Design a protein around this ligand. Sequence first.
Ligand SMILES: O=S(=O)(NCc1ccco1)c1ccccc1F
Ligand SMILES: [Br-]
Ligand SMILES: [Mn+2]
Ligand SMILES: [Mn+2]
Lengths: 137, 137
Amino acid sequence: MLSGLNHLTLAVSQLAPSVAFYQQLLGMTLHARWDSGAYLSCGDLWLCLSLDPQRRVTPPEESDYTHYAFSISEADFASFAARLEAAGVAVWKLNRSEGASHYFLDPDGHKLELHVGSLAQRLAACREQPYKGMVFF
Amino acid sequence: MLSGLNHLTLAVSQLAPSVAFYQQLLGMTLHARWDSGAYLSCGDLWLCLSLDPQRRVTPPEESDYTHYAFSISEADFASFAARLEAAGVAVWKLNRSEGASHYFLDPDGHKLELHVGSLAQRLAACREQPYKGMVFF
Ligand SMILES: O=S(=O)(NCc1ccco1)c1ccccc1F
Ligand SMILES: [Br-]
Ligand SMILES: [Mn+2]
Ligand SMILES: [Mn+2]
C-alpha cells in the first residue's frame, strides 16, 4: 500500500542556479549536494534536484499542464508572490479557481504554484458548485 | 514560508484510463472526477489528474529524469513491484542508485517510482556510500 509522496525529483540543466532558486529564493532547506544533484526539504517534502543534460529550458507554451504546488499560508502569500516578482520570476497562468494561487516557473521551465487551501477545502467548494460532469466518491 | 507540497498535478491524455491506473492499480483513493479531471489522495498527498489535449504519451528515452516517488513499506515493496511487473506496467530504470526503488511508467509515460525509506535514511546511507563529490550540510 502506498502511504504518500516519498520524493519529487526535478531534472535541472544547471545545478548552481537551481540550488539557488530552491534554497535561497524559495527558502527550502539544503541537506546535501553532490556533483550531479542536491537534496532539499520543504516541510515534509523531500525534493531532489538531478543534473540532467537532457533537461531543456522549456517555454511554458511548450509543456503540458503538469505542475507542482507548494503550500503557503494566506497571510504569507502576497509577500512571497512579491518576492518572486522582484526576482523577475515569470508567471505562466493567472488564478481563476478557489484559493489563492500564484503560478510561476523555475529556471528550467518547471511549472510551479503557490497555493492556499487543502483538498478538503477544494472538495467542499466543488460540492457547492460542481464542475461539469462532477461525481463524488 | 513554504511548508510542503500542496498538490501534484499530472496532465493526462485520457482521463478514465489514468484514473483507473492510479485508483485501481496503485490503490490511491478517488475522491471526485469531472469531465476534465480527477482528485485522488495517497496518504497526505493530493493528486490531481488533469485532462490536457497537450499531453503526449512519452517514451522514457524522450523525457528527462523528472519523476515522482511514492512511499511504500519494506514489507510491501517487493510484492507490489512484482504485481506491477506481472500486470505489464512499463519501466524506465533498473539500477538502484538511490536505495530500494522500483521505477515504472504511467499510461502517458510519467516517470513514477516506489521507494522504501525517508530522506533521513537516504542521507545516512549516503554517508557510507556517497554520491561522487557529496557534501552534507
Ligand atoms: O466517471 S466514472 O464513474 N469515474 C470513476 C472511475 C474511473 C476510473 C476509476 O474510477 C467512470 C468513467 C468511465 C468509466 C467508468 C467509470 F466509473
Ligand atoms: Br473518470
Ligand atoms: Mn494547481
Ligand atoms: Mn527517485
